[PDB]
Amino acid sequence: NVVKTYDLQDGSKVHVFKDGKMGMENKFGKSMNMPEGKVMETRDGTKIIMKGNEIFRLD
Template identity: 45%
Template sequence: MSIRKSIIVLALSLPALSAFALDSSGIVKSTPLKGGAVLHEFSDGKMAMEDKYGRASHLNHSTVMETADGKSITMVGDEVARLNQALQKHYKN
């Protein structure tokens, strides 16, 4: 196979691979927080916060939040883009 054909095959297959990677980023657990926000945990342990209006919102890493039942949770990661994509997919269906 020539180099040109290899580059073409690679260029055509990369978008398909990235689509599969995006679908595998599912939310495992959602925890309601005080004030109406929701903390979502992904399968890799990283987290993202949805505000009380249903939008993905930024929160600093290692921020301590209080759940609706009074427990404390420390933020791991800030996956705003992943949550935004999941919310858009959820509201489309």
């Protein structure tokens, strides 16, 4: 179902689904409200940001 998952510094995660949908979870796996316009950083140092339910990655 998930086509991609971002593994964020803070232990939270963002799943991207086959259907274009997106979902974020805290370090406890509980579902969260995803922040818009806020830079998030992955485990491996990649910076991303969400806007209009799409994901942008630091170029």
